[PDB]
Amino acid sequence: NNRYDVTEWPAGNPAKDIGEVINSIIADIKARQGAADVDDGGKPGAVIYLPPGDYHLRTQVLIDISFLRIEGSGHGFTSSSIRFNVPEEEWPDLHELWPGGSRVIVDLPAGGAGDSAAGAAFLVAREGSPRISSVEFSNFCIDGLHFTADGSGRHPENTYANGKTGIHVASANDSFRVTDMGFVYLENALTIHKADALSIHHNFIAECGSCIELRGWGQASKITDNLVGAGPRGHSIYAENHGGLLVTANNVFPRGASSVHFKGVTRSSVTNNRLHAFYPGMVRLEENSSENLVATNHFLRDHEPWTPFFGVDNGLDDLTGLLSISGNNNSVIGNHFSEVVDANEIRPEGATPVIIRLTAGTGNFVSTNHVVAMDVDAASSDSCFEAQVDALLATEAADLAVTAVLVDPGSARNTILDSGSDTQVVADRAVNAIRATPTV
Amino acid sequence: NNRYDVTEWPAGNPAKDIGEVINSIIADIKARQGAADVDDGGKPGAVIYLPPGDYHLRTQVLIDISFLRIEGSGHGFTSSSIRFNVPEEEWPDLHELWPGGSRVIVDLPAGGAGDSAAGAAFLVAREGSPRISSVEFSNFCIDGLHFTADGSGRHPENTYANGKTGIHVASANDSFRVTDMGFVYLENALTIHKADALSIHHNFIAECGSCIELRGWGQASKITDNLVGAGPRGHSIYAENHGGLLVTANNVFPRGASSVHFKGVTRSSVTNNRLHAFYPGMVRLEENSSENLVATNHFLRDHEPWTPFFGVDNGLDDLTGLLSISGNNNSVIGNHFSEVVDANEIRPEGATPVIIRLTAGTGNFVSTNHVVAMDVDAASSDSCFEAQVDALLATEAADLAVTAVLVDPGSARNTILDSGSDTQVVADRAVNAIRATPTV
Amino acid sequence: NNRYDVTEWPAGNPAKDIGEVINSIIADIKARQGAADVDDGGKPGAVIYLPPGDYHLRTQVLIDISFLRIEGSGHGFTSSSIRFNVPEEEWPDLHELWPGGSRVIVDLPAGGAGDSAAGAAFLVAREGSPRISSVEFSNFCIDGLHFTADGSGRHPENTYANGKTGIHVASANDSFRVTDMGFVYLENALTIHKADALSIHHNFIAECGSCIELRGWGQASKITDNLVGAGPRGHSIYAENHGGLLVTANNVFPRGASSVHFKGVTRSSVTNNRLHAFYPGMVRLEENSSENLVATNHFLRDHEPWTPFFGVDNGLDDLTGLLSISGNNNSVIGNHFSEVVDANEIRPEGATPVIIRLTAGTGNFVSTNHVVAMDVDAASSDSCFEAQVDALLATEAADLAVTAVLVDPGSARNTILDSGSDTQVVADRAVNAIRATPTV
């Protein structure tokens, strides 16, 4: 025992309100595990199992205890975004309509003016000592169900706004795991404050406004092997005030405002990811993000190919850069950048797009980065995945002049090696060490 | 419920034909999940559990539904290749003879002249909309049992031919997972057509003719953390017409024809793998494979040390290259190449082996690759793992001249930096930018 | 069946001695699986499940059979190190005191003068043929409970000494997996001899004297996605006489003697890890460790910030190097090194710290490594995680002269490119090819 199955718990009804059921199970664990030091233990925690099923959550789950594992048997993802943009008269012929797996349907109202925490299906919160530790979420689905009108006049299902969060961790935490999950149609998939030695590993986090956000501060954590797709006003991967973070082996696709965004992040590594955006400002190191390694990533920036998101932007223009750095002593090494754009969609009109921009800070080392830039003709089609795939396989283009590296006058004493020809590297040679990539 | 255990299903017998049992379970799921939009769901799918056991499959499983998870409790791998080459009179003294775990023994005949799909233990197929989604295969064993005579006069168990496939996905699919599996003694372990956002993660796929094949087209997928060993007429990792594929953190060992093979693959990353082959042509980018990052891989090419495969080749000679590129605007950065061969086994007689070959395309960037080449004396021994390990630890060699980079006249406007001395880099300096690695 | 739950086994008591229970289950599996070739199988193995719980182990588990899986439902980690250094009168106010999850408490005496194997909770041993294969340990907790006085006069809980091992594999093995575990308060977490195609993946291995040790020899293995923290007389990741090892995507934090230590390791890759130490000698390639790739790692060396470990060293001084190489033909490419030290704590007094040191061997290629060095004021605070995090986020420092690369006269014919200025690279230019990083 200490093993519970939500379909076998005698209180509540998991189809109607799985929140109530899980809170009831948590009360039972605490009632049984009252003593902290009996035969060298006494509070080992528990596992709560969700079989495949459609489970409505109407009461927020409060997780107050260490070593709690909540697990299911399916990440359950299907593209609600595609389905909600299929003409409605065709829905009866679709084999299915909704995500599945071990599915928690989040039916909470939007969070108040206090916060988003109130809109989270699972809230992890505990103050005092020690930090809550080794909570595990595994292999289930959290589904926000619908997005809602936002004043823009866009389809309500394409706004990425509903005030719902999948998992929200409010308190300092240690050794947490989020693995094998599916998150869909949430304004925020996963928000974790004050994380130590966290692992976010092998999840599918897509069609959420903002996917992964590490807030407050943190250390010694990792975000690995995820498939991630956000919305144009949110983050794919975000961290602030982290040290020693490792972000690797993620496949991040559209349509977040950015792929990776750091504020005040130090001594971290963003390496070996595949990153694909429809907008500039893919990787942002801001507010003294320093001594970070950004290595061997594949960056692709192109244009949205799917008609229902034509015109949808993140507000940033082509001078922003694909990689933007404000901070000291970073290392940008061995990245590939593909810039695949339509010259007459470049903004501002007639600008030369920038790839890497150093806006502030000193001592950045940028070496052995390959920039390929291409001028294609933009187009939109109605069939989502066909258009996406055709777009990736298309190479049928003219050449395009770009600025591979732009060092603003506010950044100096950088070293730029083999990351562009002299024309491609716009920088003051008197206060930065520049070696042009050899040419013919 | 929606949870099934194949040993607790009242129809069929999983020891005799687990195929029939699983198909029966799938019919039950469909019978119960008929309605697509009842209380915001209705087709959440299911989980089918295989306890550890030896289960014969005589009827192909047809997977027709989204959010189906099939799981077990052991990848169950043992080297049938070693065992089948042990003298038969010694078999009674072996502690065990066969793979184990949650084991599906594939007893289907070879596929007809239509196709290999008919020889697959699990076939995933569904047409219409939407694409089948979020099917999961986890932590079980698929065993082809024996290889069969192929006309070559080789031992029938060493042919890698039986017409059997582990898992075959014929239809466009989204968010699929194959994790923690074991595949053994199959002509094809895993063949997945038309994949979107697929994850093939942390499997053991070995002693199969061909291991992973991604066919038709695809996008935004990943192949990570696998242990992979194929056969000399097949692929280790293969993809065609994929965009945005990430292949990382795999340990690929002998004896596939290649370690990674791309046809028409674009905007992808093959980075941070350990790759070991007994033959040339380890990593092949062919048929306009363009804008790919190939970074920080460890390549080892040497000679087969195990006597029962002496003389077995993939048909390619030492001029082929360890890495061969036909395509535009790729990035080859920070790889290590160990070429450990016996000079008198080099073919054609008296050739200088090539390491990286650019056969066609423009704009490839090749930078900071270390090539170490060595002339050793070839040998074969009868004890498989002892010989393999001794061979890897052996450094007792003379020096060997190699061509680090060969740029054919059909490839031009490439950039080659610090990837060999001038002698080691055979290329037209007038139409490629070449910087020799500094020497003494 | 072949599925067992230790709380449902009729012999012994898993709370008192889970060792006896598991050994009893193993005898039952062998009694049932006597025949090796009945209908193409007969020894498929088994799965043993540990629900969340506190389980004392007083008898060593002997694992003698292939395809055994032992699994739980929680890695269960909490910092016993922090708790044992909290004043004792405050313990009654802590929410909990001990690790949890599916918890095996190791209550064996320390191993005799024969060996440490006798102190292991789980011993995997079998001689003869074939090698034991595809044993899996997953998602449970192994807890050494306490460290003991060691003659140093340190707190007994801070010695990292108790003679206990989590899992010890004594025999040649194939296709083993250790995944999702938690190890805490063990002198040795995981020791695996003679490993072939092993995967140590996604574990939490911390506050153990020595974490991962691969001994004897091995091949084609991988250590990926682990969180790892050892003690100052032990190893974080250690291997000897391995070929084809891949160590990637690990986040290794203090306070092991080293982060990665190789003896006699060849043709391997240590790439894309985040490594953090409080002492020199972070990555050691020793005793002819040759043809290894060390690429795109983030190294941080700084000072211990937590008062109860002030003064605790690994015995090595600042001339040792962060990366030390004794071996031929290695490749050191694209690493970031942050050296964050207090100039008056540098030892010996007045030394210039070294970052990469080549002590012996020929043909090493060192290219495009960024070294950032800083002089800060050392300090200690009592609040562990606050001090750790503040320390990582602190950049408030003066500049510090370092030797980026030191090539001893005993190492020659190396190539050093863009890994330091001429002053920073101390090497005989007549017998090594040196290119200084361009400067202003």
TrEMBL record, chains A, B, C:
| Matching Pfam families | NosD
Q: GO MF terms on file?
A: inulin fructotransferase (DFA-I-forming) activity; transferase activity
The organism encoding this protein is Pseudarthrobacter chlorophenolicus (strain ATCC 700700 / DSM 12829 / CIP 107037 / JCM 12360 / KCTC 9906 / NCIMB 13794 / A6)
Q: What class of enzyme is it?
A: lyase
Annotated ranges, domain Periplasmic copper-binding protein NosD beta helix? 156-301
- Does the UniProt entry include the keyword Kinase? no
Record flagged with keyword Acyltransferase: no
Keywords of the record, alphabetical order, are: Lyase
Its protein name is Inulin fructotransferase (DFA-I-forming)
InterPro entries given in the database record: NosD_dom, Pectin_lyas_fold, Pectin_lyase_fold/virulence
Q: What is its EC number?
A: 4.2.2.17
Q: What domain of life does the UniProt record list for this protein's source?
A: Bacteria
